[PDB]
Amino acid sequence: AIGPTSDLHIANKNISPDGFNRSAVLVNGTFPGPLITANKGDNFQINVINQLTDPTMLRSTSIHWHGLFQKGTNWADGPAFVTQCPIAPGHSFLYDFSVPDQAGTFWYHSHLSTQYCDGLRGPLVIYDPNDPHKSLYDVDDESTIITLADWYHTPAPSAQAVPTPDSTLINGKGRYSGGPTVPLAVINVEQGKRYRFRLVSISCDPNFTFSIDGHNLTVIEVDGVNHEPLTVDSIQIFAGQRYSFVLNANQPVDNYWIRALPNVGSTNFDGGINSAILRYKGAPNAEPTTTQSTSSNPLNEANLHPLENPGAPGAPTAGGADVNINLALAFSGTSGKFTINGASFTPPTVPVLLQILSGAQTAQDLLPSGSVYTLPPNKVIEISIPGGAVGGPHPFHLHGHAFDVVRSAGSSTYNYVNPVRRDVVSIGAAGDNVTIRFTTDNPGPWFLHCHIDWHLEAGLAIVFAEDPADVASANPPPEAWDQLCPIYDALPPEQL
Numbered sequence: 001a002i003g004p005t006s007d008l009h010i011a012n013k014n015i016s017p018d019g020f021n022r023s024a025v026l027v028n029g030t031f032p033g034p035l036i037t038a039n040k041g042d043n044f045q046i047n048v049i050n051q052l053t054d055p056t057m058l059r060s061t062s063i064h065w066h067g068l069f070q071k072g073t074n075w076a077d078g079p080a081f082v083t084q085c086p087i088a089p090g091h092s093f094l095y096d097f098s099v100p101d102q103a104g105t106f107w108y109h110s111h112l113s114t115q116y117c118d119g120l121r122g123p124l125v126i127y128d129p130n131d132p133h134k135s136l137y138d139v140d141d142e143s144t145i146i147t148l149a150d151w152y153h154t155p156a157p158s159a160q161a162v163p164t165p166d167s168t169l170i171n172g173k174g175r176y177s178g179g180p181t182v183p184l185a186v187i188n189v190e191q192g193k194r195y196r197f198r199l200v201s202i203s204c205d206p207n208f209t210f211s212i213d214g215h216n217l218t219v220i221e222v223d224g225v226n227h228e229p230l231t232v233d234s235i236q237i238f239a240g241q242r243y244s245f246v247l248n249a250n251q252p253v254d255n256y257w258i259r260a261l262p263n264v265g266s267t268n269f270d271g272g273i274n275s276a277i278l279r280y281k282g283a284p285n286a287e288p289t290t291t292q293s294t295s296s297n298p299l300n301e302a303n304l305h306p307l308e309n310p311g312a313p314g315a316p317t318a319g320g321a322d323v324n325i326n327l328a329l330a331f332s333g334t335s336g337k338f339t340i341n342g343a344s345f346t347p348p349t350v351p352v353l354l355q356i357l358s359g360a361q362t363a364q365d366l367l368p369s370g371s372v373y374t375l376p377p378n379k380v381i382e383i384s385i386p387g388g389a390v391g392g393p394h395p396f397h398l399h400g401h402a403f404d405v406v407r408s409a410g411s412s413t414y415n416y417v418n419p420v421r422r423d424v425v426s427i428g429a430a431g432d433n434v435t436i437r438f439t440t441d442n443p444g445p446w447f448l449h450c451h452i453d454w455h456l457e458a459g460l461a462i463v464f465a466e467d468p469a470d471v472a473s474a475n476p477p478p479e480a481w482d483q484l485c486p487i488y489d490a491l492p493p494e495q496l
């Protein structure tokens with residue numbers, strides 16, 4: 001693990017996490033990237049060094065700190081052409097920000113095109129010295145991080161129209177169907193001990209149905225936010241979501257299968273794919289022979305309730321927010337592009353933040369045309385995103401904010417009293433009307449998009465220009481940020 005001041009080298013490396021050798025885009029030569037840790041209230045100074053050289057994937061880069069609000073530091077949020085131009089090959093950029101009011105489980109990833117699929121993704125944990133759930137567990141450290149990743153054998157820019165993952169990597173290890181039987185990830189526990197496992201989806205696409213043979217899971221945290229403990233026997237986790245769950249190692253000393261079943265790709269466990277191993281101290285060095293019992297108590301988002309200040313903002317009636325926005329999704333089979341209310345997001349040449357700093361303060365004047373929505377400050381926003389467009393279920397992610405999910409997928413019931421509070425939500429399927437609320441307490445241009453990276457690349461996104469009149473003042477960027485676009489725009493396309 002590394003601390004909140006760190007020097008991250010982004011470079012290409014040949015790796016074989018599932019036994020197939022491919023060039024990747026990695027942080028300090030590992031997949032996943034190193035765990036970044038901090039304590040509540042810390043200041044981050046993450047110096048990102050771009051040493052990329054391999055022209056089969058993108059060689060510029062930009063890193064997003066997923067789930068961190070970036071109040072007053074919108075310029076450090078990371079989404080390319082929304083809050084910055086990319087860091088050019090050979091150049092560096094210091095992400096300098098603070099987290100005064102957040103503690104929980106997060107992650108970081110490239111936010112340039114589909115580059116994070118090529119390997120630039122890792123976990124980020126902000127610990128709370130006064131964690132209200134601390135009495136529920138004994139162990140919470142780097143050994144209790146569980147990353148779930150999809151992995152591809154072809155570089156991201158070579159993507160088929162509908163890419164499909166080759167393997168599931170748990171803590172960086174896993175197998176592909178028909179591939180070598182490489183060692184699976186092992187998570188070691190001591191009988192009688194209680195573990196805070198921090199489950200991080202760093203997926204580019206599949207959701208995972210996560211379970212551990214013979215063990216219930218007590219969910220205590222959702223996308224960085226403390227929730228009332230909820231015991232389940234399986235968790236369906238969508239791209240970019242995080243859960244902390246407490247596991248009580250109260251079963252016989254043995255090896256137990258950890259299961260992460262994707263919704264796309266190989267949807268079984270044959271030959272140890274989509275699997276890892278929970279090993280009790282004293283158990284043999286062997287693979288499990290446990291079997292899966294049918295989930296009778298799967299996690300339902302409708303049962304998650306925030307531990308602190310439960311309750312959605314605004315009046316507890318439908319459309320009873322200050323601003324009400326409905327997002328209609330479509331997909332063109334001929335062009336392969338997604339649209340939101342008729343507009344496909346294409347990255348603008350001038351990043352949205354720079355446009356605003358340059359005087360573009362209206363939806364009419366902000367690029368890309370039709371994709372940028374202005375919001376007034378200190379108001380309650382309600383967003384509905386009905387499901388149904390192809391490629392689902394789409395997990396939508398809002399930057400700069402956590403939101404309250406007043407209506408979740410698979411339910412027609414509204415909850416304003418204690419709905420789940422998180423930052424990535426599945427919008428479900430045709431017939432769902434997933435609805436979220438948040439308060440505009442954070443000026444800046446904030447991305448809202450499907451976190452399936454292939455769909456984001458195909459245009460499934462909008463930008464909220466929240467309080468554009470204040471944005472320059474509240475987010476005054478450092479000189480290093482001013483130089484990013486001049487450097488980037490001087491690049492010939494050959495060098496990207």
Ligand SMILES: *[C@@H]1O[C@H](CO)[C@@H](O)[C@H](O)[C@H]1NC(C)=O
Pocket residue numbers: 002006007008009028034
């Ligand atoms: C990445 O590698 C550089 C080069 O040695 C090192 O200075 C830096 O601290 C590393 N960062 C990590 C391991 O997070």
Ligand SMILES: *[C@@H]1O[C@H](CO)[C@@H](O)[C@H](O)[C@H]1NC(C)=O
Pocket residue numbers: 318319382384433435
């Ligand atoms: C969808 O959700 C919005 C937000 O609560 C609500 O106003 C609208 O009536 C809902 N429509 C349907 C058909 O459920």
Ligand SMILES: [Ca+2]
Pocket residue numbers: 007008009049
């Ligand atoms: Ca360095």
Ligand SMILES: [Cu+2]
Pocket residue numbers: 064066109240397451
């Ligand atoms: Cu993310």
Ligand SMILES: [Cu+2]
Pocket residue numbers: 064065066067397398399400
């Ligand atoms: Cu994010």
Ligand SMILES: [Cu+2]
Pocket residue numbers: 391392393394395450451452455456460
């Ligand atoms: Cu999607």
Ligand SMILES: [Cu+2]
Pocket residue numbers: 064079111397399447449
């Ligand atoms: Cu994003």
